[PDB]
Amino acid sequence: GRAVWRGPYVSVSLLEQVITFAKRNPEWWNIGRFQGSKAPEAINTFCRSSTVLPDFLGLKFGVHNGREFVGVEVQEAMVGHKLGEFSQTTFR
């Protein structure tokens, strides 16, 4: 994968989406997210190649798969992977 000494990749567009979300919901971002409350809304994105951050913990992401935005709620075990690994593009 990407060389560890060069760091991760995260898209700039994804960061802007999260920053706007935090401003809209300051109370949940600071306190609610850690007591266990669910996110008040979801963030739709096309950034399937971005890495999942633990600051994205309790966040709900709608990841595009070609047709719709598949909901993905971040868990601790999903840390370190790409958003595109949890949104399937083919169906049988």
Partner 1 sequence: LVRPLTKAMTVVLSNGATLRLPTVYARAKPWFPVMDLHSHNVWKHKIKTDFQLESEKNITPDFSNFYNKFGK
Q: List residues binding partner 1 (CB under 8 A).
A: 7-8, 29-31, 33-34, 53-55, 79
- Give 2 or 67: the residue with its C-beta nearer to partner 1: 2
CB 72, min distance to partner 1, A: 17
Strand partners, 64: 69
With 0-12 / 13-18 / 19 or more C-beta atoms within 10 angstroms meaning exposed / middle / buried, residue 36 is exposed
CB 70, min distance to partner 1, A: 23
Q: Which residues have CB under 8 Å from 33's CB, separation 6+?
A: 39, 57, 58
CB 8, min distance to partner 1, A: 6
